[PDB]
Structures are given as structure tokens and as C-alpha cells.
Amino acid sequence: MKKYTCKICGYIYNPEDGDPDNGVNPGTDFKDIPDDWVCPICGAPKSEFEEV
Ligand SMILES: [Zn+2]
């Protein structure tokens, strides 16, 4: 699985780390994150993300 980054702020979603505080377990491929999840830094939607 690949890392994704927020086009707005530069946050990196690392699938090996997930975002567990917001319910995204380690091992979650970006496509599988629930589509109401937002960037934990700037609040951007998934649609603003891209592969590193
Ligand atoms: Zn962001």
C-alpha cells in the first residue's frame, strides 16, 4: 500500500500507521478509509489527497 498526501497542507497518510484516533486502523488502504474522514491537520476531504 502507498502513502497519500493532502494537497492542501502536506499531511501524509501512511497506511502502515493508519489514523487510529479517528477510527482508521493501521493497515487501511486509502481507498478503504470511510469517505467522511478528513485530513487530521487541515480538515480537507479525501478528494484532496494524492499518492506520494
Ligand atoms: Zn490537510
Of 39, 19, 36, the residue nearest 28 (C-alpha): 19
Residues in contact with 8: Cβ distance below 8 Å, sequence separation at least 6, in sequence order? 39, 42, 44, 48
Q: Kindly give the distance from the C-alpha atom of residue 42 to the centroid of ligand 1, in angstroms, as a whole number.
A: 4
Query: Pairing mode, if any, of strands 4-6 and 12-13?
Result: antiparallel
Q: Where are the domains of the chain?
A: 1-52
Give the CATH class of 1-52: mainly beta
Pairing of strands 12-13, 49-51: unpaired
The Cβ of residue 28 has, within 10 Å, a number of other Cβ atoms equal to: 20
CA angle 34, 36, 5 (to 5 degrees): 80
The answer to whether residues 17 and 5 touch, using CB atoms and an 8 Å cutoff, is no
List the determination method: X-ray
Q: How far is the CA of 8 from the centre of ligand 1 (A)?
A: 5
Concatenating the DSSP letter of every residue in 1-52 gives ---EEETTT--EE-TTT-BGGGTB-TT--GGGS-TT-B-TTT--BGGGEEE-
How many angstroms does the Cα of residue 46 sit away from the middle of ligand 1?
A: 9
Best CA proximity match to 52, nearest among 10, 20, 22: 10
